[PDB]
Structures are given as structure tokens and as C-alpha cells.
């Protein structure tokens, strides 16, 4: 055991399976959940761990880097750029199934073409954006039509729900046109949680109700400014709901551990960990029967 091997062993083996009854009626205490959360290693990579010349300019935060083994590599669809780097990682889903999500940071003006290239190359049909309206991060989608490198994007439809905005986009590359659904969930401040879990579960139903629209199933892109806290919470919620529906139990600790192996730092706060328990207890009470 290196520190690194102690980290990997913990994340592969930690678990706290809870029956749905225990989650709803007899949950671990707040102090227990915080203690449990603080035990989980971050699995952050250091700048020294990454040998990708030039990547710094494509990171929003120099301390938040994509783990090498699961990072998304861009192909060569950009005649302007020579590298394959984007701050994004493939994320396992329910039962360990590969590439169910990509977690990424919010695009910067200089990584917007990279983002759409990833969307194209990975045959993404759904993007989940988690934000607090408060703006600074750049709008990487057009009001009606914009070109980003070799990609033309066009808004087809836009509808407002109280919790989120759904945009139906078309992305074009050469003679080829694809559909992409975009959902912007807007009252989630970074480092914090939403006021209640109702809208979040609606967002989750919205995601679950989304048709596959690509030639081949692709990852769901989930992002927020750093791509770890709110991104991690959303994905953990989705997996946790899937465990509850299929099995009537959930292992929240194991879900967060599996997320951290895929991308360092997923779920950043003990408050966010506690809210995850709350949201899943809510989902359990909403289940049919």
C-alpha cells in the first residue's frame, strides 16, 4: 500500500447498503453521514500526474483535472487544434455499466468547439446542465443559430418548466444533422444544495423520459462549472433512484465511491451527501404502490 493503493482499495470496497425502509424510516444520523462522507478519499489527480502538454489553458480550475484512465479523448475533427484534451471523464452507471455519463466542467469560450466535438464524436443525445442562475460561464448554445468550429447549432424548440429549461437543438457537421436535447436546471448554487428535492426529481424523470436519438446509445453529458460537485450529486441521484426502483435498496456510499474512481472529487460537500439521502428518501416515497 502506497497512499494511492490505499485510496483505490477504499473506493473499490467501501459500502453502506440501506434497505428502502431504513432509508425512509431509520436513516443514519446527520453526524454519521458527515463522518462517513469525510472518510471517502477524493481521488484528485495532481498536475504532475497528467502529462498532456498544453492542457492548462483548457481547465477552468487548475486543481480540478480529469483522471487519465477515464478521460474523454477528442479525435481529429478540428483542423485548427492539434490535441485530444478536454476536462471530461466517462462515468460508469447502474451496476458499473460503462460510459453511461460524461462528467465535464462548463465550457470556457476557448473549449466550446471541444465540447461540441465531444458531443458529436460520442453520439450524445442529452445534455444536463446544473447551475445557479448567476451568467459568468459562457453560453455555448445559440439563441437561434451559431457556428462553433466545424459545427453549426440551431435551436429547434425551447420550453420552460418551473424547474428547468428544455432546449431541442440540431447540431450539424458536413452534410450530417443530429438532434440533441439540452436541459438547464438553474437553482443550484455551487458548493451547496437546492432548497428542496422536488424539482431535482422532476429533472430526473425528465432525463428518464428522454428518447434515445443517436445511431448508437451514447453517454449523457452532465456538467456544472467544475463538473464535480453538482455534477456528482445529479449522477448519484440518478443511480440511487435506479437502485431503489430495481432493488428496493440503495448503497449511496458505494455509488459515491464508484463516481470518485471515474472522476476525482465527485460530490464535494457533506451537506450535498446528506441532501442525496434526503432526495432518495423522497424518491422512495414517490414510488408507485
Amino acid at each position: 500500500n502506497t497512499p494511492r493503493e490505499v485510496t483505490l482499495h477504499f473506493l473499490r470496497t467501501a459500502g453502506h447498503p440501506l434497505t428502502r425502509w431504513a432509508l425512509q424510516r431509520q436513516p443514519p444520523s446527520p453526524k454519521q453521514l458527515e463522518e462517513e462522507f469525510l472518510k471517502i478519499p477524493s481521488n484528485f489527480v495532481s498536475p504532475e500526474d497528467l502529462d498532456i502538454p498544453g492542457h492548462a489553458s483548457k481547465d477552468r480550475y487548475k486543481d480540478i483535472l480529469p483522471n487519465p484512465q477515464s478521460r474523454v479523448c477528442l479525435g481529429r475533427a478540428q483542423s485548427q487544434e492539434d490535441g485530444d484534451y478536454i476536462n471530461a471523464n466517462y462515468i460508469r452507471g447502474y451496476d458499473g455499466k460503462e460510459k453511461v455519463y460524461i462528467a465535464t466542467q462548463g465550457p470556457m469560450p476557448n473549449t466550446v468547439s471541444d465540447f461540441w466535438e465531444m458531443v458529436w464524436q460520442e453520439e450524445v443525445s442529452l445534455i444536463v446542465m446544473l447551475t445557479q442562475l448567476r451568467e459568468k460561464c459562457v453560453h455555448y448554445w445559440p439563441t437561434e443559430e451559431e457556428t462553433y468550429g466545424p459545427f453549426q447549432i440551431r435551436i429547434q424548440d425551447m420550453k420552460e418548466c418551473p424547474e428547468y429549461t428544455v432546449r431541442q437543438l440540431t447540431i450539424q457537421y458536413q452534410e450530417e444533422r443530429r438532434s440533441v436535447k439540452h436541459i438547464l436546471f438553474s437553482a443550484w448554487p455551487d458548493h451547496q444544495t437546492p432548497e428542496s428535492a422536488g424539482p431535482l426529481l422532476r429533472l430526473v424523470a425528465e432525463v428518464e423520459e428522454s428518447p434515445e436519438t443517436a445511431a448508437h446509445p451514447g453517454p449523457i453529458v452532465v456538467h456544472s462549472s467544475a463538473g464535480i460537485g453538482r455534477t456528482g450529486c445529479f449522477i448519484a441521484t440518478r443511480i440511487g433512484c435506479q437502485q431503489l426502483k430495481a432493488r428496493g435498496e440503495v448503497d449511496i456510499l458505494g455509488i459515491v465511491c464508484q463516481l470518485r474512481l471515474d472522476r476525482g472529487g465527485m460530490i464535494q460537500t457533506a451537506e450535498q451527501y446528506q441532501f442525496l439521502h434526503h432526495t432518495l428518501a423522497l424518491y422512495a416515497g414517490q414510488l408507485p404502490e
Binding site: 477552468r60 480550475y61 486543481d63 467544475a226
Partner: peptide
Amino acid sequence: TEYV
């Protein structure tokens, strides 16, 4: 920059 710093997110932590």
C-alpha cells in the same frame, strides 16, 4: 483558478 480556485474551486478549493
